[PDB]
Coordinates of C-alpha atoms and ligand atoms in Angstrom, one line a residue:
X1 CA 35.2 163.6 -127.2
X2 CA 31.4 163.6 -128.5
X3 CA 30.8 160.0 -128.2
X4 CA 30.9 157.0 -125.6
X5 CA 29.4 153.7 -125.4
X6 CA 27.2 154.3 -122.3
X7 CA 25.8 157.6 -121.0
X8 CA 24.7 157.1 -117.6
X9 CA 22.3 159.6 -116.0
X10 CA 22.9 159.8 -112.2
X11 CA 25.8 159.2 -109.8
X12 CA 23.9 157.6 -107.0
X13 CA 24.0 153.8 -106.0
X14 CA 22.8 152.6 -109.5
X15 CA 25.0 155.2 -111.5
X16 CA 28.1 154.5 -109.6
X17 CA 27.9 151.1 -110.1
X18 CA 27.1 151.5 -113.6
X19 CA 30.2 153.3 -114.3
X20 CA 32.2 150.6 -112.6
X21 CA 30.3 147.8 -114.2
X22 CA 30.3 149.1 -117.7
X23 CA 33.9 150.3 -117.7
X24 CA 35.2 146.8 -116.4
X25 CA 33.6 145.6 -119.7
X26 CA 35.8 147.9 -121.6
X27 CA 32.6 150.3 -122.4
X28 CA 33.3 154.2 -122.3
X29 CA 30.8 155.8 -120.0
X30 CA 30.1 159.3 -119.4
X31 CA 27.9 159.8 -116.4
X32 CA 26.1 163.1 -115.9
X33 CA 25.2 164.1 -112.2
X34 CA 22.9 167.0 -111.4
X35 CA 24.4 167.1 -108.0
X36 CA 28.0 168.6 -106.9
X37 CA 29.0 165.1 -105.9
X38 CA 28.1 161.4 -106.0
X39 CA 25.5 159.7 -103.6
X40 CA 22.3 160.6 -105.3
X41 CA 19.7 160.5 -102.8
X42 CA 22.3 160.2 -100.2
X43 CA 24.1 163.1 -101.6
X44 CA 21.2 165.6 -101.8
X45 CA 18.8 164.3 -98.9
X46 CA 20.9 165.2 -96.1
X47 CA 18.4 166.4 -93.6
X48 CA 19.1 165.3 -89.6
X49 CA 18.2 161.7 -89.0
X50 CA 18.0 160.5 -92.7
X51 CA 18.8 156.9 -92.5
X52 CA 18.2 153.9 -94.7
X53 CA 15.3 151.5 -94.2
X54 CA 17.5 148.5 -94.9
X55 CA 20.1 147.1 -92.9
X56 CA 23.3 148.6 -94.1
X57 CA 24.8 145.2 -94.7
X58 CA 22.2 144.5 -97.2
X59 CA 21.9 148.0 -98.4
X60 CA 25.5 148.2 -99.6
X61 CA 27.2 146.8 -102.8
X62 CA 28.0 143.1 -103.1
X63 CA 29.7 143.5 -106.6
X64 CA 33.1 144.0 -104.8
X65 CA 34.4 141.1 -102.3
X66 CA 37.0 143.6 -101.0
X67 CA 34.6 146.5 -100.4
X68 CA 32.3 144.4 -98.6
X69 CA 35.1 142.9 -96.4
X70 CA 36.8 146.2 -95.9
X71 CA 33.7 148.7 -95.2
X72 CA 32.7 148.7 -91.5
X73 CA 29.0 150.0 -91.3
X74 CA 28.8 151.7 -88.0
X75 CA 25.3 150.6 -87.2
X76 CA 22.4 148.4 -88.3
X77 CA 20.7 151.0 -90.3
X78 CA 23.4 153.7 -91.7
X79 CA 22.8 157.3 -91.5
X80 CA 22.7 159.4 -94.7
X81 CA 26.3 160.8 -94.0
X82 CA 27.6 157.2 -93.7
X83 CA 26.0 155.9 -96.7
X84 CA 27.2 159.0 -98.5
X85 CA 30.9 158.3 -97.2
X86 CA 30.3 154.9 -98.3
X87 CA 29.4 155.8 -101.9
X88 CA 32.3 158.4 -101.9
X89 CA 34.7 155.7 -100.8
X90 CA 33.2 153.4 -103.7
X91 CA 33.9 156.3 -106.0
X92 CA 37.4 156.7 -104.8
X93 CA 38.1 153.2 -104.9
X94 CA 36.9 152.6 -108.2
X95 CA 38.0 155.8 -109.8
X96 CA 34.4 156.7 -110.8
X97 CA 34.3 160.5 -110.6
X98 CA 36.6 161.1 -113.7
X99 CA 33.6 159.8 -116.0
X100 CA 31.1 161.9 -114.0
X101 CA 30.3 165.6 -115.2
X102 CA 28.7 166.7 -111.8
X103 CA 26.4 170.1 -111.6
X104 CA 25.3 168.8 -115.1
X105 CA 21.8 168.1 -115.5
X106 CA 20.7 165.9 -118.6
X107 CA 17.8 167.9 -120.3
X108 CA 17.3 165.8 -123.5
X109 CA 18.1 162.4 -124.8
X110 CA 17.3 162.2 -128.7
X111 CA 17.4 158.8 -130.5
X112 CA 19.2 158.6 -133.8
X113 CA 17.2 155.7 -135.3
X114 CA 19.5 155.4 -138.4
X115 CA 22.5 154.9 -136.1
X116 CA 20.9 153.5 -132.7
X117 CA 22.6 156.0 -130.8
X118 CA 21.4 158.6 -128.2
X119 CA 22.4 162.2 -128.4
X120 CA 22.4 163.3 -124.7
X121 CA 22.0 167.1 -124.2
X122 CA 22.6 168.9 -120.9
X123 CA 22.1 172.1 -119.1
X124 CA 26.0 172.8 -119.3
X125 CA 25.9 172.4 -123.2
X126 CA 27.2 168.9 -123.1
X127 CA 26.1 167.0 -126.4
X128 CA 27.3 163.4 -126.3
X129 CA 26.4 160.6 -128.3
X130 CA 25.7 157.2 -126.5
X131 CA 25.3 153.8 -128.0
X132 CA 23.4 153.2 -124.7
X133 CA 21.5 155.5 -122.2
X134 CA 21.3 154.3 -119.0
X135 CA 19.1 156.4 -116.7
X136 CA 20.1 155.8 -113.0
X137 CA 18.0 158.8 -112.1
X138 CA 16.7 157.1 -109.0
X139 CA 13.1 156.4 -108.0
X140 CA 12.9 159.0 -105.3
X141 CA 13.1 162.9 -106.6
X142 CA 11.8 165.7 -104.6
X143 CA 8.1 166.4 -104.4
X144 CA 7.3 170.1 -105.1
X145 CA 8.2 172.6 -102.5
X146 CA 4.9 173.1 -100.8
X147 CA 3.7 176.7 -101.8
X148 CA 2.5 178.7 -98.8
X149 CA 1.1 182.4 -99.2
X150 CA 3.6 184.8 -97.7
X151 CA 6.4 182.2 -97.2
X152 CA 8.4 185.0 -98.9
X153 CA 7.4 187.3 -96.0
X154 CA 8.4 185.1 -93.1
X155 CA 11.7 186.6 -91.4
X156 CA 12.9 183.5 -89.7
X157 CA 14.7 180.6 -91.4
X158 CA 13.0 178.5 -93.9
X159 CA 15.0 175.1 -94.3
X160 CA 14.1 172.4 -96.4
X161 CA 14.7 168.9 -95.7
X162 CA 15.5 168.2 -99.4
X163 CA 18.1 171.0 -99.5
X164 CA 19.6 170.6 -96.1
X165 CA 22.3 173.0 -95.4
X166 CA 25.7 170.8 -95.5
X167 CA 26.9 172.7 -92.3
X168 CA 23.5 171.8 -90.4
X169 CA 21.1 174.1 -88.7
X170 CA 21.2 174.9 -84.9
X171 CA 17.7 174.6 -83.7
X172 CA 18.7 175.6 -80.2
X173 CA 16.7 178.6 -78.6
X174 CA 14.6 178.3 -81.8
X175 CA 10.9 177.9 -81.9
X176 CA 10.5 175.5 -84.9
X177 CA 7.9 174.3 -87.1
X178 CA 8.0 171.3 -89.2
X179 CA 5.7 171.0 -92.0
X180 CA 5.6 167.6 -93.5
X181 CA 5.3 164.2 -91.8
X182 CA 6.7 161.9 -94.3
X183 CA 10.1 160.1 -93.6
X184 CA 12.1 163.3 -93.9
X185 CA 9.8 164.9 -91.1
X186 CA 9.7 161.7 -89.0
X187 CA 13.4 161.5 -89.2
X188 CA 14.4 165.0 -88.5
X189 CA 11.5 165.8 -86.0
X190 CA 13.1 163.9 -83.0
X191 CA 16.6 165.7 -83.9
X192 CA 14.9 168.8 -84.2
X193 CA 13.1 168.6 -80.9
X194 CA 16.1 167.4 -79.1
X195 CA 17.4 170.9 -79.4
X196 CA 14.8 173.3 -80.2
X197 CA 13.3 175.7 -77.8
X198 CA 10.0 174.5 -79.2
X199 CA 8.8 172.0 -81.9
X200 CA 5.4 172.4 -83.8
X201 CA 4.6 169.6 -86.1
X202 CA 2.0 170.7 -88.6
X203 CA 0.6 167.4 -89.8
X204 CA -1.8 167.0 -92.4
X205 CA -1.8 163.3 -92.9
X206 CA -0.2 160.9 -90.2
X207 CA 2.0 158.2 -91.5
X208 CA 3.1 154.7 -90.4
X209 CA 6.4 154.6 -89.0
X210 CA 7.9 151.8 -86.8
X211 CA 11.0 151.9 -84.6
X212 CA 14.3 151.6 -86.5
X213 CA 15.7 149.4 -83.7
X214 CA 18.9 150.8 -85.1
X215 CA 21.8 149.3 -83.1
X216 CA 25.5 150.0 -83.2
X217 CA 27.5 147.3 -84.9
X218 CA 30.4 145.9 -82.8
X219 CA 33.4 144.0 -84.1
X220 CA 32.2 140.5 -83.1
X221 CA 28.8 140.6 -84.7
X222 CA 30.3 142.5 -87.9
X223 CA 33.0 139.8 -88.5
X224 CA 30.3 137.3 -88.1
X225 CA 28.1 138.9 -90.9
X226 CA 31.1 139.5 -93.1
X227 CA 32.2 135.9 -93.0
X228 CA 28.5 134.8 -93.9
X229 CA 28.2 137.5 -96.6
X230 CA 27.8 135.2 -99.7
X231 CA 25.1 133.3 -98.1
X232 CA 23.3 136.5 -97.0
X233 CA 23.6 137.9 -100.5
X234 CA 22.4 134.6 -102.0
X235 CA 19.4 134.9 -99.7
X236 CA 18.9 138.5 -100.6
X237 CA 18.9 138.0 -104.4
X238 CA 16.4 135.1 -104.2
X239 CA 14.4 136.9 -101.8
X240 CA 11.1 139.1 -102.1
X241 CA 12.6 142.4 -101.2
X242 CA 16.3 142.0 -101.4
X243 CA 17.0 141.4 -97.8
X244 CA 17.3 138.0 -96.2
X245 CA 13.9 137.9 -94.8
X246 CA 11.1 135.5 -95.5
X247 CA 7.4 136.5 -94.2
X248 CA 5.9 133.9 -91.9
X249 CA 4.7 130.7 -93.3
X250 CA 1.0 130.8 -92.3
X251 CA -1.1 134.1 -93.1
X252 CA -2.1 136.7 -90.6
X253 CA -5.4 135.3 -90.0
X254 CA -4.5 131.7 -90.1
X255 CA -2.2 132.1 -87.2
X256 CA -3.2 132.1 -83.5
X257 CA -4.0 135.6 -81.8
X258 CA -1.2 134.8 -79.3
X259 CA 1.5 133.9 -82.2
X260 CA 0.4 137.1 -83.9
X261 CA 1.7 139.5 -81.3
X262 CA 4.6 137.3 -80.9
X263 CA 5.8 137.7 -84.7
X264 CA 4.5 141.4 -84.9
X265 CA 6.8 142.0 -81.9
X266 CA 9.6 140.3 -83.7
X267 CA 9.1 142.1 -87.0
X268 CA 8.6 145.4 -84.8
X269 CA 12.2 145.1 -83.7
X270 CA 14.1 144.6 -86.6
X271 CA 12.7 146.9 -89.2
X272 CA 9.9 149.1 -90.8
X273 CA 9.9 147.9 -94.4
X274 CA 9.9 144.4 -93.2
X275 CA 7.2 144.7 -90.4
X276 CA 5.0 145.5 -93.5
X277 CA 5.9 142.0 -94.4
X278 CA 5.5 140.0 -91.2
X279 CA 2.8 138.0 -92.7
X280 CA 2.5 136.7 -96.3
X281 CA -0.9 138.1 -96.9
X282 CA -0.3 141.5 -94.9
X283 CA -0.3 143.6 -98.0
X284 CA -2.8 141.7 -99.9
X285 CA -5.6 140.9 -97.5
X286 CA -7.4 144.2 -96.0
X287 CA -8.6 142.1 -93.0
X288 CA -5.0 140.8 -92.5
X289 CA -3.6 144.3 -92.7
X290 CA -6.2 145.4 -89.9
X291 CA -4.3 143.2 -87.6
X292 CA -0.8 144.7 -88.3
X293 CA -2.7 148.1 -88.4
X294 CA -4.1 147.5 -84.8
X295 CA -1.0 146.3 -83.6
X296 CA 0.8 149.3 -84.6
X297 CA -2.0 151.5 -83.3
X298 CA -1.6 150.1 -79.9
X299 CA 2.1 150.4 -79.8
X300 CA 1.9 154.1 -80.6
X301 CA -0.8 154.5 -78.1
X302 CA 1.4 152.9 -75.4
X303 CA 4.4 155.1 -76.1
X304 CA 2.6 158.2 -76.7
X305 CA 1.2 159.6 -73.5
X306 CA -1.5 162.0 -74.7
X307 CA -4.1 159.8 -76.2
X308 CA -5.5 162.7 -78.3
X309 CA -1.9 163.0 -79.7
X310 CA -1.7 159.5 -80.2
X311 CA -4.9 159.2 -82.2
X312 CA -3.8 162.1 -84.3
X313 CA -0.4 160.3 -84.9
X314 CA -2.7 157.4 -86.1
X315 CA -3.0 157.3 -89.9
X316 CA -6.9 157.5 -90.5
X317 CA -7.9 154.9 -93.0
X318 CA -4.8 154.0 -95.1
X319 CA -3.5 150.3 -95.0
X320 CA -0.3 149.8 -93.1
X321 CA 2.5 149.3 -95.7
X322 CA 0.5 150.8 -98.5
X323 CA 2.5 153.9 -98.1
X324 CA 6.1 152.6 -97.6
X325 CA 6.3 152.4 -93.7
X326 CA 8.8 155.1 -92.3
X327 CA 11.6 154.0 -89.9
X328 CA 11.7 156.3 -86.9
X329 CA 14.4 156.9 -84.0
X330 CA 12.5 157.9 -81.2
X331 CA 9.7 159.8 -83.2
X332 CA 6.6 158.9 -81.2
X333 CA 8.2 159.5 -78.1
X334 CA 9.2 162.9 -79.4
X335 CA 5.5 163.8 -78.9
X336 CA 6.0 163.1 -75.0
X337 CA 8.2 166.2 -74.7
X338 CA 6.7 169.3 -73.2
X339 CA 8.5 171.2 -76.1
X340 CA 6.6 169.6 -79.0
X341 CA 3.0 170.2 -80.3
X342 CA 1.4 168.4 -83.0
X343 CA -0.7 170.7 -84.8
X344 CA -3.6 168.9 -86.5
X345 CA -3.8 170.6 -90.0
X346 CA -7.1 169.0 -90.5
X347 CA -8.4 171.0 -87.7
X348 CA -6.4 174.1 -88.5
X349 CA -5.1 173.9 -92.1
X350 CA -2.0 176.4 -92.7
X351 CA -3.5 179.3 -94.7
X352 CA 0.0 181.1 -94.8
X353 CA 2.9 182.4 -93.3
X354 CA 3.4 185.9 -92.1
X355 CA 6.8 187.8 -90.8
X356 CA 6.7 186.0 -87.4
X357 CA 5.3 182.4 -88.4
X358 CA 2.7 180.1 -89.6
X359 CA -1.0 181.3 -89.5
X360 CA -3.4 178.4 -89.3
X361 CA -7.2 178.5 -89.5
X362 CA -7.1 178.7 -85.8
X363 CA -3.9 180.1 -84.3
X364 CA -0.9 182.0 -85.3
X365 CA 2.5 180.4 -84.7
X366 CA 5.6 182.4 -83.6
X367 CA 8.4 180.5 -85.4
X368 CA 12.0 181.3 -85.8
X369 CA 12.3 178.5 -88.3
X370 CA 10.1 176.5 -90.6
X371 CA 11.4 173.1 -91.7
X372 CA 9.6 172.1 -94.9
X373 CA 10.0 168.4 -94.4
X374 CA 9.2 167.3 -98.1
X375 CA 8.1 164.0 -99.6
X376 CA 9.2 162.4 -102.7
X377 CA 8.2 162.7 -106.4
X378 CA 6.6 159.8 -108.2
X379 CA 8.9 157.1 -109.4
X380 CA 8.8 158.7 -112.7
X381 CA 9.6 162.2 -111.3
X382 CA 13.3 162.4 -112.4
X383 CA 12.6 160.7 -115.7
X384 CA 9.8 163.1 -116.4
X385 CA 12.1 165.9 -116.1
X386 CA 14.1 164.4 -119.1
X387 CA 13.0 164.7 -122.6
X388 CA 13.8 161.4 -124.0
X389 CA 12.9 161.2 -127.6
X390 CA 12.6 157.8 -128.9
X391 CA 11.4 156.3 -132.3
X392 CA 9.2 158.5 -134.5
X393 CA 10.3 161.4 -132.3
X394 CA 7.7 160.2 -129.8
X395 CA 8.6 161.3 -126.2
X396 CA 9.0 158.7 -123.4
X397 CA 6.6 161.0 -121.4
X398 CA 4.2 160.5 -124.3
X399 CA 4.5 156.9 -124.5
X400 CA 4.0 156.6 -120.7
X401 CA 0.9 159.1 -121.0
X402 CA -1.4 156.2 -120.0
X403 CA 1.1 154.8 -117.5
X404 CA 4.4 153.6 -117.5
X405 CA 5.0 150.8 -120.1
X406 CA 7.9 148.6 -120.1
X407 CA 9.2 145.2 -120.6
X408 CA 10.6 144.1 -117.3
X409 CA 11.3 147.8 -116.8
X410 CA 14.3 147.5 -119.0
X411 CA 12.6 147.7 -122.5
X412 CA 10.5 150.1 -124.2
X413 CA 9.4 149.8 -127.7
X414 CA 10.4 153.0 -129.5
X415 CA 13.3 153.2 -127.0
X416 CA 16.1 151.0 -128.2
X417 CA 19.5 150.9 -126.3
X418 CA 17.5 152.8 -123.5
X419 CA 17.6 151.5 -120.0
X420 CA 15.8 153.0 -117.2
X421 CA 17.2 151.6 -114.1
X422 CA 15.1 150.3 -111.0
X423 CA 12.0 152.1 -112.2
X424 CA 8.6 151.2 -113.5
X425 CA 8.3 147.6 -114.4
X426 CA 10.9 146.4 -112.1
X427 CA 10.6 145.9 -108.2
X428 CA 12.0 149.4 -107.8
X429 CA 11.5 150.9 -104.3
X430 CA 9.9 147.5 -103.3
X431 CA 13.3 146.0 -103.3
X432 CA 16.8 146.8 -101.9
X433 CA 18.0 149.4 -104.3
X434 CA 21.7 148.5 -104.1
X435 CA 21.0 144.9 -105.0
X436 CA 18.2 146.0 -107.5
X437 CA 20.8 148.7 -108.9
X438 CA 23.3 145.8 -109.1
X439 CA 20.9 143.4 -110.8
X440 CA 19.7 146.1 -113.5
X441 CA 23.2 147.4 -114.2
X442 CA 24.4 143.7 -114.4
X443 CA 21.6 142.8 -116.7
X444 CA 22.2 146.0 -118.9
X445 CA 25.9 145.0 -119.2
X446 CA 25.0 141.4 -120.0
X447 CA 22.8 143.0 -122.7
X448 CA 25.3 145.2 -124.0
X449 CA 27.9 142.4 -123.9
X450 CA 25.4 140.0 -125.8
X451 CA 25.0 142.5 -128.5
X452 CA 28.5 143.4 -128.7
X453 CA 29.4 139.6 -128.9
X454 CA 26.9 139.6 -132.0
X455 CA 27.8 142.8 -133.7
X456 CA 24.4 143.9 -132.9
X457 CA 23.6 147.7 -132.8
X458 CA 20.8 147.6 -130.3
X459 CA 18.4 146.1 -128.0
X460 CA 14.6 147.2 -127.9
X461 CA 11.6 146.3 -125.8
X462 CA 9.2 144.6 -128.3
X463 CA 5.6 145.9 -128.1
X464 CA 4.1 142.6 -127.5
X465 CA 6.6 142.0 -124.4
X466 CA 5.9 145.3 -123.0
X467 CA 2.0 144.8 -123.3
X468 CA 2.4 141.4 -121.6
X469 CA 4.6 142.9 -119.0
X470 CA 2.2 145.9 -118.2
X471 CA -0.5 143.2 -118.0
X472 CA 1.7 140.8 -115.7
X473 CA 2.4 144.1 -113.5
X474 CA -1.2 145.0 -113.3
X475 CA -2.0 141.3 -112.2
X476 CA 0.7 141.0 -109.6
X477 CA -0.8 144.3 -108.1
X478 CA -4.5 144.2 -108.5
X479 CA -4.1 141.7 -105.5
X480 CA -2.1 144.3 -103.3
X481 CA -3.1 147.0 -100.7
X482 CA -0.1 148.9 -102.3
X483 CA -2.7 149.2 -105.2
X484 CA -4.9 151.6 -103.2
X485 CA -6.2 154.8 -104.6
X486 CA -3.8 156.8 -102.1
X487 CA -0.8 155.0 -103.3
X488 CA 2.5 156.6 -104.5
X489 CA 3.1 153.4 -106.5
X490 CA 0.7 154.6 -109.0
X491 CA 1.1 156.5 -112.4
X492 CA -1.0 151.9 -113.3
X493 CA 0.9 150.4 -110.4
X494 CA 4.3 151.1 -111.3
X495 CA 6.8 148.6 -109.7
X496 CA 6.8 144.8 -110.3
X497 CA 5.1 143.3 -107.2
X498 CA 6.1 139.5 -107.8
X499 CA 9.3 139.8 -105.7
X500 CA 12.9 140.7 -106.2
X501 CA 14.0 137.1 -106.7
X502 CA 11.2 136.1 -109.0
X503 CA 12.0 139.2 -111.0
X504 CA 15.7 138.4 -110.7
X505 CA 15.0 134.9 -112.2
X506 CA 12.5 136.3 -114.9
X507 CA 15.0 138.8 -116.2
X508 CA 18.0 136.4 -116.1
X509 CA 15.9 134.1 -118.0
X510 CA 15.0 136.5 -120.6
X511 CA 19.0 137.2 -120.9
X512 CA 19.5 133.7 -121.0
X513 CA 16.9 132.9 -123.6
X514 CA 18.7 135.4 -126.0
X515 CA 16.5 138.2 -124.9
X516 CA 13.1 137.0 -125.7
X517 CA 10.8 139.9 -125.8
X518 CA 13.3 142.2 -127.0
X519 CA 14.2 142.9 -130.6
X520 CA 17.9 142.5 -131.3
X521 CA 18.7 145.3 -133.6
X522 CA 21.4 145.4 -136.4
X523 CA 23.6 148.2 -137.5
Ligands
LIG601 C1 15.6 158.5 -95.9 C2 15.7 157.5 -97.1 C3 15.9 156.2 -96.8 C4 16.0 155.2 -97.8 N1 16.3 154.0 -97.3 C5 16.2 153.0 -98.4 C6 16.7 151.6 -98.2 O1 17.0 151.3 -96.9 N2 16.7 150.7 -99.1 C7 16.4 151.1 -100.2 O2 16.3 150.1 -101.2 N3 16.0 152.3 -100.8 C8 16.0 153.5 -99.8 N4 15.6 154.8 -100.2 C9 15.3 154.9 -101.8 C10 16.4 155.7 -102.3 O3 15.7 156.5 -103.2 C11 17.3 154.7 -103.2 O4 17.8 153.5 -102.3 C12 18.4 155.2 -103.9 O5 18.2 156.4 -104.4 C13 18.9 154.5 -105.0 O6 20.0 155.0 -105.7 P1 19.9 155.4 -107.2 O7 21.1 155.7 -107.9 O8 18.9 154.3 -107.9 O9 19.0 156.8 -107.2 P2 19.5 158.1 -106.4 O10 20.2 157.9 -105.1 O11 18.4 159.3 -106.5 O12 20.6 158.8 -107.6 C14 20.1 159.3 -108.6 C15 20.8 160.7 -109.1 O13 20.6 160.8 -110.4 C16 20.4 162.2 -110.5 N5 19.6 162.8 -111.6 C17 18.4 162.7 -111.8 N6 17.8 163.2 -113.0 C18 19.1 163.8 -113.7 C19 19.4 164.5 -114.9 N7 18.4 164.5 -115.7 N8 20.7 164.8 -115.1 C20 21.8 164.5 -114.4 N9 21.6 163.8 -113.0 C21 20.4 163.3 -112.7 C22 19.9 162.6 -109.3 O14 20.7 164.1 -108.9 C23 20.7 161.8 -108.3 O15 22.1 162.2 -107.8 C24 15.7 155.7 -99.1 C25 15.3 157.0 -99.5 C26 15.2 157.9 -98.3 C27 14.8 159.4 -98.8

C-alpha cells in the first residue's frame, strides 16, 4: 500500500475537504495529520475564547448542501470547540478519518521527475508515493515558544495557548501572568480575568482588536439564512474576502465626517476582519486608515476607564488592519477590572522568570501561572518545516529563498503535481479559509480531472507564469497598508491582494483555458 493518487498534508478544513473532494472523483488519498485528531488550527488551538473571525455561516463548508442545512451554528462567531465539533462531524459524516494517519508529521516530499510522483516520508516511517502532493498545512502555525531565562525555574504552572490542556485550566485563586497580546491573548485574557485572582497582562506591542459582537443564533434567523444560503455563498465566492460584505462605495475621506462615524459604527458592530474594510481605501490610503485608527482609539478610550491603560492598549504607529484585526469578547472591558493589571513591557521588559514569577526591569510578579499567549508563524511556517524536494533536487525552501514564488499560489516551477493550498500567491488568510479551501481543493480536483481526462502525468507552474504572478502579487500589494515593514504578510508580500472573487475568477479562467501558465506534463 505504498502509492496513492494524492497525499494530503493536514486534516484541517482544507485537508478534510481535500480528502472528500479527491475521493469523490475516485482518487485514492492518504492524508497525514501531525495532530491526534482532525481540525487543524481548530484542533490544536484550543485556548479559552478561541473563536473565529468570520461568521460561522460563512466560515463553514458549502460543498455539502445537507451539511449546510443540517448543521446548526450556536452563535454568530463559532468558538473553537464548536468549529472542532463541526469538523469532527464533517469527518464522521464523510468518513474521512480512515484515510488520515494522525500523529504523523510529513517530514519530506521528494519528486521523482522520471515518474512525476512524490515520495512522501513521515516521522512514523511512512513512505508513500503520490501522483499529487497536496499540502493543506494551513497558513497559521505556531510562533516559537518565547524563550525566557529561568522559565525552567518557575514552580507555578506554565500554560501555552498553543497547547492548551484539553481539560482546561482553572484560574480560580490563581495569580496569572499572560505574556502575549496577539489574538490568543486577546481572546483568553477576558476569560482568564473572569476567574483569576489576579491577571497580569505583560504587553510588548498592543494590537487592534474590535468587539466580536457575537450573538447567539436563534432558530428564526437561522432558518432564514439557511434558506438564503446559496445566495450568501454566491455573494461570498464573488466577494473580496469570502464573506457577503462589500466595503462602502465612496472612500473614507470622500464621505462626510458624520456619515463616517455612522458606517464605522456599523462595521464596529458586525466584525473585526470587516471593520478593517469599512471603506475601500481603508487599507490603501494611510490618511484614510488614520480615520479608522482614530475611530478605534476613541472607542477604546471610552470603554477603558484608566486613560493611561487605554493609551497603553492603543497600538503605537501601526496601521489598523495591517496586522489582522483581532476580534474580542469583552477584552478592553477586562482592563476595567480591579484584578487585572496591564504591564507595559516597553517600560519594564521581562528579563526572566524565577521560582515565584516574572521578573521585569522594574518589579517582580508573584504568579501561580504564566500563560504564554503565542502568536502565529509566517504563512510559510508549516511549509518551511517540510523538506519538499522538487526538480533538480532543488528544495521548496530554496526556491522560496527570495520570497515565495508561485503561479496563482498553485503552481511552482520545479514542483509539478505539487499544490500548496491557501498559501503564498493566493488570497490565503485575507479570505474566508473555508471557502478558500474549497476553491483550492476544487481547483486541484479539477486540475487532476483535467490531467486524467487527457492521460497527462502532471501539471506544473511555468517559470514565466510564476514570474508574472510574483509581479502581479507585488503590484496588488505595493498599494496596500498590509504591505508595511511590520507586516506578517511578508516573506515579498505573500497573499494575493486582488480579492477572493477576482482571484477565483482568475484561477477558474486559467483552468477553463486549459491551464495557461502551467505545463501539462506527459508520462
Ligand atoms: C483564533 C483564530 C480564529 C481564526 N478565525 C478565522 C476565520 O474566522 N476565518 C478564516 O478564514 N481563518 C481564520 N483563522 C485562520 C486559520 O488558520 C484557518 O482558517 C484554518 O487553519 C484553515 O484551515 P487549514 O486546513 O487551511 O489549516 P489548519 O487549520 O492549520 O490545518 C492544517 C493541519 O495541517 C497539519 N500539518 C502541518 N504540517 C504538517 C506536516 N508536515 N505533517 C502532517 N501534518 C501537518 C497541522 O497540524 C494542521 O492540523 C483563525 C485562526 C485562529 C487562531
